[PDB]
Ligand binder design. Sequence first.
Ligand SMILES: O=c1ccn([C@@H]2O[C@H](COP(=O)(O)OP(=O)(O)OP(=O)(O)O)[C@@H](O)[C@H]2O)c(=O)[nH]1
Ligand SMILES: O=c1ccn([C@@H]2O[C@H](COP(=O)(O)OP(=O)(O)OP(=O)(O)O)[C@@H](O)[C@H]2O)c(=O)[nH]1
Lengths: 285, 285
Amino acid sequence: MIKKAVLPVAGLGTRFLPASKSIPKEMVTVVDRPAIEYVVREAVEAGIEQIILVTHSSKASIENYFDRNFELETTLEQKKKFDLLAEITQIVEEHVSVISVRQPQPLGLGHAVLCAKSVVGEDDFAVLLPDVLVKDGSGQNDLSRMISRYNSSQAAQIMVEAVPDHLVDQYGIVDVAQSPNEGESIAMQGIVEKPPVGAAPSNLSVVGRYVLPAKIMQLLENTPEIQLTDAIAMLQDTDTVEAYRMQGQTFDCGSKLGYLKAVLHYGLEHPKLGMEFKQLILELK
Amino acid sequence: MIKKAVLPVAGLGTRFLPASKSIPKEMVTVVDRPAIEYVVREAVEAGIEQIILVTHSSKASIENYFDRNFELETTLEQKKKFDLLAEITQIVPEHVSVISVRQPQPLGLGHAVLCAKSVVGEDDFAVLLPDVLVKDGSGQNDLSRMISRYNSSQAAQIMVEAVPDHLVDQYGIVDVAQSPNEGESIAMQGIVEKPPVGAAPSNLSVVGRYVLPAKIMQLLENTPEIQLTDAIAMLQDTDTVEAYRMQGQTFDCGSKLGYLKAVLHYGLEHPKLGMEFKQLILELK
Ligand SMILES: O=c1ccn([C@@H]2O[C@H](COP(=O)(O)OP(=O)(O)OP(=O)(O)O)[C@@H](O)[C@H]2O)c(=O)[nH]1
Ligand SMILES: O=c1ccn([C@@H]2O[C@H](COP(=O)(O)OP(=O)(O)OP(=O)(O)O)[C@@H](O)[C@H]2O)c(=O)[nH]1
């Protein structure tokens, strides 16, 4: 049914400096692999086949990480380290493509999703902000559940999560009737940015996953900084727009500090490293 | 007056994979800055004025990180974001030069140091392996100690530190008459590579920190593909060579568990993130 994700990655990482001065912020080493691995893996594990990096002139280290490296592949072999060889050989599944198009000047996410117009054609497509990680535990991920909900309903979906009632000013917060349950959706007439700490419509924050149709690109070319939330504003005129509520847990790798938080959570959960890792903490006082 | 330092960064970090598949294992972000910054910030602290990168074609990221980034610099005086701009200009004093030389083929540590002969000229010099981070809390880092000691003694200095008797076959370890006290040096008759767990002349791992006479250049052009501990022998005939035991802590950012250990110990002491980070940690158990 749904098989194109668009991943915007043209962002200068200003807040993630100097780490992101010379490499991209998408390649930040979370435990033992770059951040963009987990965001793609999420998409792959959901039923996506075609990844679409909207990318910048400087983020070639990204496209390259989904591709065969001759020089390494051949040194690994001469070492006889073939386990490790078969890591780098099969990062994505053999039946997944990774595509590039260029956001020429960085004029915000909305202008970035619009750069995929041509690759997305008439297909209904998800988005994933890769500066945000998501950690399902259930077994089936939040993008999995969200999509099947966009297959059933035909309503553009918007992933959101509950925050403390005293921190709703940091977040774009969705409007709704009542708050739908962990891993369900309910209609929504619009998102408010940094609402007043009282007088906020909901305690549910735009996370930065979306499943939209192609209508949306025609709208992006007519939004009076081009706003995605402006385009979903116009979609509402014609089409039902719901809020899919997470069951798992997000991480803001866009920020130095939500990055450190992510290293702790995934590191402890690392199939090999976790054991030896949990030890390295304990050992600290 | 030791004022030059060969940083060999031509490796392919197979041991630190796939982190370092598409970015150097030196550009790997410890807390908020890549790993190599800590090594240079160490070399500069100890009097170095010329940083000689023996590098590979996979590794512009590095040379660039020590350069003007034109889009970031000019974009951040648009936003008059003076604090973030601060974060990517001061990286090393105006007087510190960073010079690239290319290691065509990875035919050994030995063979890297010798690609820099051309540039080191007739002049005694230091060698710093980035794989390895060193941490002071003494107010004179281990390298400046070693350069105080080459200057007064005139005798080459091998930084070593002690390891459990049962991992000695994972290291070069040195032939010493006795163990030099944390912070001092003693003559040594030679080093061994990976001496079987029994036949180790000492517990002291060669760490990855050398001060050397510039005529080692001339003994690397004639060794039994080229090994340093080889050339440090041939000196060991003509001249005195001393093992300096280190007083500060040590982290291998070529091993995974070693990089994770550093994210923790460095991060807990970060000016800003430190107090906020420690917090994240107390919040897990
Ligand atoms: O013009 C833009 C803005 C943002 N984006 C993409 O949208 C996502 C959101 O990116 P962020 O909003 O976290 O910011 P940024 O990376 O542009 O830089 P800072 O504000 O942290 O300094 C990132 O993955 C980025 O690549 C673009 O592709 N183009
Ligand atoms: O022949 C050599 C050996 C070492 N080095 C320099 O030593 C440093 C790392 O030494 P390593 O031995 O860790 O390099 P590697 O990246 O090949 O990793 P392994 O999988 O072999 O463990 C790097 O900074 C590299 O440039 C060379 O440049 N050439």
